[PDB]
Amino acid sequence: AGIKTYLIERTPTIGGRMSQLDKTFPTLDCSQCILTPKMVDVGRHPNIEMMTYTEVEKVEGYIGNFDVTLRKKARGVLTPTEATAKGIVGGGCNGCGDCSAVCPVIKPNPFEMGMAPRKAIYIYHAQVMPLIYTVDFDSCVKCGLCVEACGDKKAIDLEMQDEFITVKVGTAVLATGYELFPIENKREWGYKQFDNVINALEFERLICASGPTGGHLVRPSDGKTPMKVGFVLCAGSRDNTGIGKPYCSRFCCMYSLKHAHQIMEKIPGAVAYLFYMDIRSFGKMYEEFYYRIQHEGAKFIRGRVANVLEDKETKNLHVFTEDTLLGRPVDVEVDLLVLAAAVQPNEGANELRKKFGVSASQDGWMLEAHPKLNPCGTTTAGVFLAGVCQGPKDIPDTVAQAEGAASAASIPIHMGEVEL
Amino acid sequence: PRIGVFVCHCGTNIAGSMSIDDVVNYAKTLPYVAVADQYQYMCSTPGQKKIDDAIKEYNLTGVVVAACSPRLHEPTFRTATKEGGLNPFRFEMANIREQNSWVHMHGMWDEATQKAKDQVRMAVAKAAKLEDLVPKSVPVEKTAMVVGGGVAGMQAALDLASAGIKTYLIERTPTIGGRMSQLDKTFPTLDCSQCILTPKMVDVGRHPNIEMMTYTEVEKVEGYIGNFDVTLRKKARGVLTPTEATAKGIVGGGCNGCGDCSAVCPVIKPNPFEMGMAPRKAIYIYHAQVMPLIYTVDFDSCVKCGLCVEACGDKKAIDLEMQDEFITVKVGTAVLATGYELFPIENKREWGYKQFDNVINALEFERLICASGPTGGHLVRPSDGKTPMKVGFVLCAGSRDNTGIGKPYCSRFCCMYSLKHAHQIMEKIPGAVAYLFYMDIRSFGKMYEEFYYRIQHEGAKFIRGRVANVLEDKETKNLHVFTEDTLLGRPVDVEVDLLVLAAAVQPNEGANELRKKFGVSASQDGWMLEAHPKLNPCGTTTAGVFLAGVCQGPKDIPDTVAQAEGAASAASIPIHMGEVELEPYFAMCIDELCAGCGMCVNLCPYSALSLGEKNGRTVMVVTEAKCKGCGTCGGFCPGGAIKMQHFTTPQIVAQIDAFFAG
Amino acid sequence: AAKSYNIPELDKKLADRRYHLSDTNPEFTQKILKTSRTIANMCYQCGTCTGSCPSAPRSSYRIRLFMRRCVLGLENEALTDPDLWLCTTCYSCTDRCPRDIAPTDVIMAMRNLAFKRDIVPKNFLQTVQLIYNSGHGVPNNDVNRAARTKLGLPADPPTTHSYPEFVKGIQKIIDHYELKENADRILKG
Amino acid sequence: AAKSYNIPELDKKLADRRYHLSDTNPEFTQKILKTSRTIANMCYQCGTCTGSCPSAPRSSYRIRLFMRRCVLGLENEALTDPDLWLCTTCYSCTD
Amino acid sequence: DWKPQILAIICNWCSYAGADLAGGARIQYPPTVRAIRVMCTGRVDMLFILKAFVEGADGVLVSGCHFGDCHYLEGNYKAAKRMFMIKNLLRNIGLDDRRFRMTFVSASEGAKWGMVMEDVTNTIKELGPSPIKEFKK
Amino acid sequence: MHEYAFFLGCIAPNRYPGCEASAIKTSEKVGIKLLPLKGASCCPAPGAFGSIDLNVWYAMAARNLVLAEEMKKDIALICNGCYKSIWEVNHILKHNDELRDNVNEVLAEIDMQFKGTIDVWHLAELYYDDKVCGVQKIKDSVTTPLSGAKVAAHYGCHLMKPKKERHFGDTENPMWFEELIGALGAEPIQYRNKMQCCGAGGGVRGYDIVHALDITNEKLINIQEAGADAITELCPFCQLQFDRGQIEIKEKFGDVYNIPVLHYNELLGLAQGMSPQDLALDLHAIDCTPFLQKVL
Ligand SMILES: Cc1cc2nc3c(=O)[nH]c(=O)nc-3n(C[C@H](O)[C@H](O)[C@H](O)COP(=O)(O)OP(=O)(O)OC[C@H]3O[C@@H](n4cnc5c(N)ncnc54)[C@H](O)[C@@H]3O)c2cc1C
Ligand SMILES: Cc1cc2nc3c(=O)[nH]c(=O)nc-3n(C[C@H](O)[C@H](O)[C@H](O)COP(=O)(O)OP(=O)(O)OC[C@H]3O[C@@H](n4cnc5c(N)ncnc54)[C@H](O)[C@@H]3O)c2cc1C
Ligand code: SF4
Ligand code: SF4
Ligand code: SF4
Ligand code: SF4
Ligand code: SF4
Ligand code: SF4
Ligand code: SF4
Ligand code: SF4
Ligand code: SF4
Ligand code: SF4
Ligand code: SF4
Ligand code: SF4
Ligand code: SF4
Ligand code: FES
């Protein structure tokens, strides 16, 4: 639309959760393939000031001028532009990888939900948009091998500190997303205590071809291929006991169907069992997706899982519930159990929405101006909501909400005046 | 020519199916190839840098990338080719992943390698003959059109107008508002629908940047992203607004909405707003809160008695001889917001919709329960006018149905509105009980699960069983609902006073005609199709047309409004710029080869071709703006006098020849 | 349900009621699909079939339960159920199923498998005997011959009651499938 | 299930298995709610209780079925069931 | 010693999308067909097909959108008429007309694209090497 | 005069011969000619024989079909169960190739082949069609009014259901059979759940007589409540159930209805002037004499 824009991301790369997704319901497209184009557009757009690995320290002002102070965290590595500004003609970071080839520290990768190693100097994945190789200063030992590997490019500055910048903006759009609810609190499903119980983002990384495995789903306990996989739907959701969330997370029925399809097509002869309590395929082509999954042969057992026991020797998981339609208790022994955990507002989202003056819903998500006729704007003028931060949604609904918020934020900028 | 061949591994997605080294050596030995080289991720910044360095070092004329599909990465590598001193259109891809690797993974490796060599050879042959194109930029008219005056149309119109673009709002009916104007209360917050919408209807009616054209249709559309020449049919309303009356010369005014005309009209007909439950005269408004309060005349039912004009008197707003006027409007973009109608549930004979008096559907129930409806807001039985005490709600009525009668999809909001109606009856009739015969309660949205909890707490009975059939008691007119309580495990026979069917929704009447006028395709489900189902749910494949609301698929008022504002933003993108670049695939006539036969002229669906005078000779003339690059004309012309810009006959024939080269 | 005790009444009382994955017979499911010629694995347990059945309100017969057993492969639960022979094949369930399933055709296939494992009521075997002997499930008798004569019709209808040479062909058809050789064996007991 | 025949074995064999609205006892439901001091009318039949019961795998006892009977008011179905005394009150369902 | 040489000319908006979808879904088929990718099948001139057959295509396949689903409103009706006439010409010049066919593959029919690939390969294998390659000399 | 092979299954010739006699006479009075089928047998009764073995069901129904195939004629039926067997096996074997093959190599042991060349019709379907005798032609042929009689129709299940496999239209509330009874001059009445099974199908009549009789008794109660004076039907199974089962209900339960059960062909004969003796109404368990007093 022509407005200069700042894109603040706390992490060293843009993309979000959809960059972690492997295939997307209900069209089964590769997530990175459909998103990499848009990441390139964002990275190349002259009207976008992409500021990754940066946070919002403080906000003051109003609809007219928001004096937003940003914290530029010490990335430790210089982009070519910043290197030329500092005087290094040879450039900054070209993403060769020699630094991480020689770094001796090895730490878990948060992008891979911890399943995979990454050095102290690292990128999340090979398709990160700013391919600039952050340094993790909480874990770097300043051995200096990385700078020797980088050589004449001189992109690594191990003494970099948090720089602060103050930016004046007219409007602001909040798009903080979500995290998975901590399902280790539900002790009856032995999430942290049994090896072969995982959650749906770890399953999505295990099934992706770019993940810690070669795209091969294997059992965490011994590295063998599963042949029976259970999907516990509603894990921590529609739950009024005070531990889980009392709401529906919207997409967990759909992504569990996707994962059942993926296992049944990737491991020949494997069977998927879905322990469900209201299959919710409400969107466009969702019911047809549900029909197709049942046709390919996923077993749908209408019963909320009661508890899970681990076999002491085979590490197999005994899932106990009742088949409510059959009318009998069941004991399904699976090689791998996947929990479709609830989602909750991201870490620090409440801090950021208090900085911007936004309130919260009953559910804990950011509140909108009018729940029916204004789902993007907030009560504080000049701030708009977009994405899962306002409530869980699929990528189509998230994008519609994001463009709606962009339109609402453009309304006062195009006019150039606002009346208080 | 000097061509560079760059073969991506796609991170073993291609190197795990063929021999990339062998493909590269073959490319090196190919004719015209200056440099052949490989990289792990050619779509990444080091890959573009590799392309650019190769261009600069080897003085490359063109670039061939043996990688994924063009439909995925033409823009990326065209921009990479531009940055480097070439034209974007000196570039050609060889799809060796989605059409070689992923389909020849298993047990066949040298065969996939030979296929890759063939594809690279054909790509090099085309690229050695590509030459420079510059995309056409066309001006964009600074107006916009919104077809549909429901919540999605009104939101899109208000958004565009407040962004500053002049907007036309076309509504086939005499009033804006849509279905939400018929709704009585709204889930999950229980607000009054008209109370929340009337503010926005007033905004639309008062906005200076919105040309609200009610009771008007779209006869025909021609043009493209730049200028859409849209012809509108202004149906004979029969009554003049004050502005039109002053224009025609009546100083005293036009219609002020007094109501004397309908007070004296003797014809009485059903009201479509009230789903037929209520009478309305031949001259009428739907409800008292219609935005243009202008009192249409229904000419199919008027008897021209002339009492209305005598009642109107000196205002002289009624013109009984008015005819359909036609207007042509030029617009830059268009937003389609046609909404929906209820699926005809009388086809499902086991639920006696038309044959039993006390079986209604959910919009008739919403009008019966509204305080502005045919009743005084009192739900009464249609058979005898008595108050019901047991009400059944048949959920999924005609939905998730693969028998060919109903719809195979979920209508999204029918579980939620049935919960709302159960609450409304249990709170409005003391002691009444609501029974919901359900098969997957779907309360997925924000506060929806809490709404479901609250309804169960107030005491609605939830019986998990799809209704099998309905029998009517011959004397009391009560309805015997037969199904199985699947959780209880027994058949049931619940006798209710009123049965409400939560019927499926389908695209509105005439929506397919309108989307064919605008060039939009349809989905598997029958709704209008979007450009990309994940990352572009508003735009369509035809440029300059955008979707908003239930017309793209069923949705609640929150999702509909988000979609409408998204569509308004997408329609504003090209208007604010004022330029838009077309893809240079146009047909170009070579005049000193054209013989003027004129036979190609009728092969263009877009009428881009015509016969004109150039240098005395009658030759063919291409309106390069109207051409879309299909190639039908250029595939027809026997003399080869039509050139297709990036898919020329020499290029395609070079590809064929290279395929058969050994 | 702790284990097998080999005391028959206690085994009956403490039978394991809990479904295990060892209980599924995919071969049984595939045989049912082939014989019934219907998409039975696509049931989503809406209950319309049971809600329409005329046998359900007066018995323990549940066609939806039989569909679930078919889907889960519960052979020896479906076949031995005495409420497998209470279906009148009225086809109301098939008329109304939203998934285009023929539950009554699934019932018919189940009945065929039950016969092949020798569970079958005796009226069926007696009808087999009658059709083998005369080609007619309801054969003629002397009083009806007299009634037909008094009417004016021939004492026997134009069927295999009056053309006994086609009975031999009917018998060869039945013998090819061994229906008589199984019916008489089962009746002998 | 056509009507009452007054032949006890045939009445037992052809007992009406079909739930009617005449079968509901709201007074029974209210007494249960008062005495139990629990929100029993809010069950949505997930089956977790039966899936956790130790009496269910060896009998016809179904606590979820008893909850459904409570919700629907099926007095004389809940009370006369001999599997009302197979609950060990282990509280796993409540847990 | 002999491998069939089959050439496909597939439109961009339904047949290329369908082939891409088949690849994405990992539907395997034999590697005998190589495609050209024009915008519409209306672009396909008769001389393209005849040039392929005279260079020695053992088979030629032209794949496009279903009737009523052309991206450019009616460009595959023109292609259908052209290919009917091409079928007639090949029959009357004495070449086997089943070496040529035109399939209508939508954007979502990756499975049908795989089946088309298999069937075209099988038919050409039954037919054998084209006679033009030896009739030229 | 259209000509059809007359299949004539087991119950009409051997228990209710007046049904077949009136069929031939009334069909000849209207423009239809019913030709005997040469050596036809039991259509393998769909319940009691299909429940046992579907392959032998197919083989016997196909043999019955190829008899009329050699006759080169179209089958005409008067039984809903026989319609199920004959018509449905004809339809299945006209489209399923492997089943054609299997049935043909079974039938080749008796020098006999199925090719699928004929069509199967129910006699009431022919009476309703307009090309063949229509409702107006039935009204024309009627000579005794049969006025002042309330008559309840039982459609049965195997003629009309499933509607995805037949072509008779709505199964929830059809009125076509009510038009044929209205043509005769008798007023057809509507009763609760008129589309309910009589209970005799599928072999239940034999397996569990009490269950089948309870299903029948539900219907009889509804019909008496409506006020019927007879029950017309288009099936000898359903007639046998409604006729014998009234006696078995009177003995096993304590319910008395005494409602005559007549095939539509018997009512058509009564309307066209055939005598009760010529219709053999003395062969029914339930006396028809009150109904005869009313309509005569
Ligand atoms: C296992 C799983 C599978 C799924 N599968 C599908 C699927 O197949 N199809 C589908 O359509 N949807 C799917 N979804 C849902 C989908 O992931 C969401 O719809 C979508 O990611 C929403 O994106 P978002 O931008 O709103 O949030 P996010 O993707 O979470 O993005 C939020 C971004 O903001 C950043 N951020 C957070 N807080 C701050 C802060 N204070 N300052 C700066 N930056 C911040 C985060 O680092 C992140 O980059 C799935 C979800 C899960 C959990
Ligand atoms: C019984 C019922 C209850 C509901 N309750 C709720 C609720 O409580 N809460 C909620 O959020 N949602 C509810 N919904 C859903 C809600 O109605 C929709 O989300 C919403 O109305 C979508 O609006 P729309 O503008 O897209 O379509 P519509 O409201 O249908 O508007 C479309 C408009 O376009 C016009 N139009 C159509 N074709 C043409 C044409 N060719 N040319 C010109 N104009 C045309 C129509 O006349 C109409 O004015 C309910 C739906 C139903 C059926
Ligand atoms: S070695 Fe230097 S240039 Fe290369 S990736 Fe590491 S920091 Fe970047
Ligand atoms: S300084 Fe040492 S520990 Fe730190 S990133 Fe460089 S090599 Fe790794
Ligand atoms: S989306 Fe499905 S799995 Fe997720 S909480 Fe809602 S009902 Fe449960
Ligand atoms: S250009 Fe295509 S093939 Fe190459 S790495 Fe990128 S996505 Fe993979
Ligand atoms: S009488 Fe005239 S001014 Fe008044 S409402 Fe009618 S048309 Fe309008
Ligand atoms: S002319 Fe007569 S019928 Fe027509 S609107 Fe006026 S009063 Fe009514
Ligand atoms: S929204 Fe609910 S009632 Fe409507 S079709 Fe979907 S599941 Fe059925
Ligand atoms: S371009 Fe070709 S077809 Fe068109 S007028 Fe000229 S010669 Fe004729
Ligand atoms: S390519 Fe030819 S036929 Fe197609 S739109 Fe352009 S001018 Fe018209
Ligand atoms: S009606 Fe069909 S879908 Fe529903 S339970 Fe019966 S067989 Fe399953
Ligand atoms: S066919 Fe059998 S299962 Fe189906 S409704 Fe009739 S009796 Fe019940
Ligand atoms: S009582 Fe049992 S069935 Fe009901 S919600 Fe609680 S655990 Fe689920
Ligand atoms: S208390 Fe224990 S025994 Fe009783 S119902 Fe609950 S889980 Fe079962
Ligand atoms: S777009 Fe494919 S045939 Fe025209």
Short mmCIF file of N, CA, C and O in Angstrom, two decimals, chain B residues 69-71 95 98-99 102-105 108 111 115 118 122 585 606 628 630-632 635-636 644 647-649 655 657 659-660, chain E residues 7 12 16 19-20 23 26-29 31 33-37 39-40 42-43 45 51-52 55-57 72-74 78 82:
data_model
loop_
_atom_site.label_atom_id
_atom_site.label_comp_id
_atom_site.label_asym_id
_atom_site.label_seq_id
_atom_site.Cartn_x
_atom_site.Cartn_y
_atom_site.Cartn_z
N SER B 69 9.40 -26.17 -9.67
CA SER B 69 8.43 -25.77 -10.68
C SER B 69 8.50 -24.27 -10.98
O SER B 69 8.76 -23.46 -10.08
N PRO B 70 8.26 -23.88 -12.23
CA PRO B 70 8.09 -22.46 -12.53
C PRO B 70 6.98 -21.80 -11.75
O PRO B 70 7.15 -20.67 -11.28
N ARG B 71 5.85 -22.49 -11.57
CA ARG B 71 4.75 -21.93 -10.80
C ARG B 71 5.17 -21.63 -9.37
O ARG B 71 4.52 -20.81 -8.70
N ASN B 95 11.97 -28.01 -14.87
CA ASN B 95 11.40 -28.66 -13.69
C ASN B 95 11.92 -30.08 -13.60
O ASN B 95 11.40 -30.98 -14.26
N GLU B 98 9.70 -31.74 -9.22
CA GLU B 98 8.33 -32.19 -9.06
C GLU B 98 7.87 -33.05 -10.22
O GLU B 98 6.81 -33.68 -10.12
N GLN B 99 8.63 -33.09 -11.31
CA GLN B 99 8.30 -33.90 -12.46
C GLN B 99 9.38 -34.89 -12.82
O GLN B 99 9.24 -35.60 -13.81
N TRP B 102 10.49 -36.59 -7.54
CA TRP B 102 9.41 -37.03 -6.69
C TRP B 102 8.53 -38.06 -7.35
O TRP B 102 7.73 -38.70 -6.67
N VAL B 103 8.67 -38.25 -8.66
CA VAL B 103 7.89 -39.24 -9.39
C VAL B 103 8.74 -40.39 -9.90
O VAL B 103 8.17 -41.39 -10.36
N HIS B 104 10.06 -40.29 -9.85
CA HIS B 104 10.93 -41.40 -10.21
C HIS B 104 11.93 -41.67 -9.11
O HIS B 104 13.11 -41.93 -9.36
N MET B 105 11.48 -41.59 -7.86
CA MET B 105 12.35 -41.92 -6.73
C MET B 105 12.87 -43.35 -6.81
O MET B 105 14.08 -43.58 -6.87
N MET B 108 14.86 -46.55 -9.96
CA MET B 108 15.07 -46.12 -11.34
C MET B 108 15.78 -44.77 -11.31
O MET B 108 15.17 -43.74 -11.04
N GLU B 111 17.43 -43.82 -15.47
CA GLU B 111 16.28 -43.35 -16.24
C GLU B 111 15.89 -41.93 -15.83
O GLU B 111 15.59 -41.09 -16.69
N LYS B 115 16.04 -38.53 -18.11
CA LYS B 115 14.94 -37.57 -18.19
C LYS B 115 15.40 -36.17 -17.82
O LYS B 115 14.99 -35.19 -18.45
N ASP B 118 17.30 -34.65 -20.67
CA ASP B 118 16.38 -34.22 -21.72
C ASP B 118 15.70 -32.91 -21.35
O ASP B 118 15.57 -32.01 -22.19
N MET B 122 16.01 -29.33 -23.41
CA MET B 122 14.87 -28.57 -23.93
C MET B 122 14.84 -27.16 -23.34
O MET B 122 14.55 -26.18 -24.05
N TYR B 585 2.89 -11.44 -22.08
CA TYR B 585 2.65 -12.64 -22.87
C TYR B 585 1.77 -12.35 -24.07
O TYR B 585 1.26 -13.28 -24.69
N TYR B 606 -11.69 -12.45 -25.56
CA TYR B 606 -11.64 -11.12 -24.98
C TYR B 606 -11.78 -10.01 -26.01
O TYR B 606 -11.70 -8.84 -25.65
N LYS B 628 -4.64 -11.56 -23.26
CA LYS B 628 -4.27 -12.25 -22.03
C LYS B 628 -3.18 -13.28 -22.21
O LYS B 628 -2.76 -13.88 -21.23
N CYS B 630 -3.22 -16.20 -24.03
CA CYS B 630 -3.61 -17.60 -24.16
C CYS B 630 -2.90 -18.27 -25.32
O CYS B 630 -2.35 -19.37 -25.18
N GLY B 631 -2.89 -17.63 -26.48
CA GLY B 631 -2.23 -18.16 -27.65
C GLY B 631 -3.12 -18.79 -28.68
O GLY B 631 -2.60 -19.38 -29.63
N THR B 632 -4.43 -18.71 -28.52
CA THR B 632 -5.33 -19.36 -29.47
C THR B 632 -5.16 -18.78 -30.87
O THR B 632 -5.02 -19.52 -31.84
N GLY B 635 -1.83 -19.79 -32.37
CA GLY B 635 -1.84 -21.18 -32.76
C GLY B 635 -2.73 -21.44 -33.95
O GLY B 635 -2.60 -22.50 -34.58
N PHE B 636 -3.62 -20.52 -34.27
CA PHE B 636 -4.45 -20.66 -35.46
C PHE B 636 -3.76 -20.16 -36.72
O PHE B 636 -3.63 -20.91 -37.70
N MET B 644 3.63 -14.89 -30.31
CA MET B 644 3.33 -14.97 -28.86
C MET B 644 4.62 -14.60 -28.17
O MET B 644 5.59 -15.28 -28.41
N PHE B 647 6.39 -17.38 -25.73
CA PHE B 647 6.14 -18.76 -26.21
C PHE B 647 5.96 -18.66 -27.71
O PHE B 647 4.89 -19.00 -28.17
N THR B 648 6.98 -18.20 -28.43
CA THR B 648 6.95 -18.03 -29.90
C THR B 648 7.09 -19.39 -30.56
O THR B 648 7.64 -20.26 -29.94
N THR B 649 6.61 -19.55 -31.79
CA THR B 649 6.73 -20.82 -32.52
C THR B 649 8.21 -21.19 -32.61
O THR B 649 8.51 -22.32 -32.28
N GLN B 655 12.31 -26.33 -28.76
CA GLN B 655 12.17 -27.29 -27.67
C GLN B 655 11.88 -28.69 -28.21
O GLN B 655 12.48 -29.67 -27.76
N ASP B 657 12.61 -29.88 -31.21
CA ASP B 657 13.81 -30.35 -31.90
C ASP B 657 14.86 -30.81 -30.90
O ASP B 657 15.53 -31.83 -31.13
N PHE B 659 14.30 -31.99 -27.91
CA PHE B 659 13.87 -33.26 -27.37
C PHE B 659 14.28 -34.41 -28.28
O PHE B 659 14.75 -35.45 -27.81
N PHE B 660 14.12 -34.23 -29.58
CA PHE B 660 14.46 -35.35 -30.45
C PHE B 660 15.94 -35.40 -30.81
O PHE B 660 16.37 -36.38 -31.43
N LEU E 7 6.03 -37.31 -26.13
CA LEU E 7 6.12 -35.88 -25.89
C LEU E 7 4.76 -35.38 -25.43
O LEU E 7 3.75 -35.69 -26.07
N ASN E 12 -0.57 -24.66 -18.61
CA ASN E 12 0.03 -24.21 -17.37
C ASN E 12 -0.93 -24.28 -16.20
O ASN E 12 -0.50 -24.46 -15.06
N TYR E 16 -0.24 -28.72 -15.92
CA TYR E 16 1.01 -28.54 -15.20
C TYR E 16 0.77 -28.56 -13.70
O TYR E 16 1.56 -29.14 -12.95
N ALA E 19 0.24 -32.27 -12.77
CA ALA E 19 1.51 -32.99 -12.73
C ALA E 19 2.33 -32.59 -11.51
O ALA E 19 2.95 -33.45 -10.86
N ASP E 20 2.34 -31.30 -11.18
CA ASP E 20 3.03 -30.84 -9.99
C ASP E 20 2.42 -31.43 -8.73
O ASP E 20 3.14 -31.80 -7.80
N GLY E 23 3.52 -35.01 -8.40
CA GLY E 23 4.87 -35.04 -7.86
C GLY E 23 4.91 -34.74 -6.38
O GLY E 23 5.59 -35.42 -5.61
N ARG E 26 3.85 -37.56 -4.41
CA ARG E 26 4.78 -38.68 -4.54
C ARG E 26 4.13 -39.87 -5.24
O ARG E 26 4.30 -41.02 -4.82
N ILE E 27 3.39 -39.60 -6.30
CA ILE E 27 2.79 -40.64 -7.12
C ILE E 27 3.80 -41.06 -8.17
O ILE E 27 4.21 -40.24 -9.01
N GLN E 28 4.23 -42.31 -8.13
CA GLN E 28 5.25 -42.79 -9.04
C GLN E 28 4.65 -43.18 -10.38
O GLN E 28 3.50 -43.64 -10.45
N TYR E 29 5.42 -42.99 -11.44
CA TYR E 29 5.06 -43.47 -12.76
C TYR E 29 6.33 -43.56 -13.59
O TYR E 29 7.36 -42.99 -13.22
N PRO E 31 9.34 -43.11 -16.27
CA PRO E 31 9.95 -41.88 -16.81
C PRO E 31 10.07 -41.88 -18.33
O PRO E 31 11.17 -41.85 -18.90
N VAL E 33 7.70 -39.85 -20.48
CA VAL E 33 7.07 -38.68 -21.08
C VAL E 33 7.83 -37.43 -20.66
O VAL E 33 8.17 -37.26 -19.49
N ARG E 34 8.10 -36.54 -21.62
CA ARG E 34 8.70 -35.24 -21.37
C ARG E 34 7.76 -34.15 -21.86
O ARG E 34 7.21 -34.25 -22.95
N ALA E 35 7.59 -33.10 -21.05
CA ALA E 35 6.55 -32.10 -21.27
C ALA E 35 7.13 -30.77 -21.74
O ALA E 35 8.31 -30.49 -21.57
N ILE E 36 6.26 -29.94 -22.32
CA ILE E 36 6.66 -28.70 -22.96
C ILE E 36 6.13 -27.47 -22.22
O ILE E 36 6.83 -26.46 -22.13
N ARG E 37 4.93 -27.55 -21.65
CA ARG E 37 4.36 -26.43 -20.89
C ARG E 37 4.09 -25.15 -21.66
O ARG E 37 4.92 -24.24 -21.66
N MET E 39 1.00 -22.03 -22.26
CA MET E 39 0.06 -21.38 -21.34
C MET E 39 -1.30 -22.05 -21.36
O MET E 39 -1.81 -22.47 -20.32
N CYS E 40 -1.93 -22.09 -22.52
CA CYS E 40 -3.20 -22.77 -22.73
C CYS E 40 -2.97 -23.85 -23.77
O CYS E 40 -1.96 -23.86 -24.47
N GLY E 42 -5.01 -23.94 -26.20
CA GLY E 42 -5.29 -23.20 -27.41
C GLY E 42 -4.05 -22.78 -28.15
O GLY E 42 -4.11 -22.56 -29.36
N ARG E 43 -2.92 -22.67 -27.46
CA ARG E 43 -1.68 -22.32 -28.11
C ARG E 43 -1.19 -23.42 -29.03
O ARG E 43 -0.47 -23.15 -29.99
N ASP E 45 -0.58 -25.42 -31.84
CA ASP E 45 -0.83 -25.45 -33.26
C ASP E 45 -0.75 -26.88 -33.76
O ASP E 45 -0.09 -27.73 -33.17
N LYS E 51 5.00 -31.78 -36.48
CA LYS E 51 6.45 -31.70 -36.39
C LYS E 51 7.00 -32.74 -35.43
O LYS E 51 8.01 -33.37 -35.71
N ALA E 52 6.34 -32.93 -34.29
CA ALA E 52 6.76 -33.97 -33.36
C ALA E 52 6.71 -35.34 -34.02
O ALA E 52 7.67 -36.12 -33.96
N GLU E 55 9.46 -35.71 -36.62
CA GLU E 55 10.77 -35.91 -36.02
C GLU E 55 10.91 -37.28 -35.40
O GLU E 55 12.04 -37.75 -35.23
N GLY E 56 9.81 -37.92 -35.04
CA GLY E 56 9.92 -39.30 -34.63
C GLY E 56 9.29 -39.61 -33.30
O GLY E 56 9.65 -40.61 -32.67
N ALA E 57 8.37 -38.78 -32.84
CA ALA E 57 7.65 -39.10 -31.62
C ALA E 57 6.89 -40.40 -31.79
O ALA E 57 6.03 -40.52 -32.66
N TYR E 72 -8.35 -19.31 -19.73
CA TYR E 72 -8.82 -18.39 -20.75
C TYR E 72 -10.08 -18.96 -21.35
O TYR E 72 -10.04 -19.99 -22.02
N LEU E 73 -11.18 -18.25 -21.20
CA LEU E 73 -12.52 -18.82 -21.12
C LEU E 73 -12.79 -20.03 -22.01
O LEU E 73 -13.49 -20.95 -21.59
N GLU E 74 -12.27 -20.03 -23.23
CA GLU E 74 -12.66 -21.08 -24.16
C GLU E 74 -11.50 -21.57 -25.02
O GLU E 74 -11.71 -22.00 -26.15
N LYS E 78 -10.98 -24.82 -28.88
CA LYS E 78 -10.18 -24.72 -30.09
C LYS E 78 -9.19 -25.86 -30.18
O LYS E 78 -9.01 -26.47 -31.24
N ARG E 82 -8.99 -28.89 -32.97
CA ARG E 82 -7.75 -29.12 -33.69
C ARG E 82 -7.28 -30.55 -33.53
O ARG E 82 -6.82 -31.16 -34.50
#
